[PDB]
Design a protein around this nucleic acid. Structure first.
Length: 96
RNA sequence: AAUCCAUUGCACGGAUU
């Protein structure tokens, strides 16, 4: 699957250092992405399938787009962040 | 908790008398 480049309120981040625990990762992600707009939530799972990944849900698509373009490749816990838009809407967004 | 193995994965595993 080619990188998902169609704008979405949610950015999908992968290539994250898997040693960072869930609480610290969410807190560090919030601290860094909050300069782009209002974050609705950050979904992190350390399961086999979902580890090394995170979903940052912005209240506005414009915030997600700026976040993606700006933070693409940022060296984080010694690995360049890889960012795409989520393929589908987050449920929080989908109810709104 | 820690170390190790395996995992690059689009959601809402495994090992350490």
């Amino acid at each position: 699957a080619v990188p998902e480049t169609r704008p979405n309120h949610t950015i999908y981040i992968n290539n994250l250092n898997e040693k960072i625990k869930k609480d610290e990762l969410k807190k560090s992600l919030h601290a860094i992405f909050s300069r782009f707009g209002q974050i609705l939530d950050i979904l992190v799972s350390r399961s086999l399938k979902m580890r090394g990944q995170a979903f940052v849900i912005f209240k506005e698509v414009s915030s997600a787009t700026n976040a993606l373009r700006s933070m693409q490749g940022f060296p984080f816990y010694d690995k360049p962040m890889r960012i795409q838009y989520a393929k589908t809407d987050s449920d929080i967004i989908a109810k709104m």
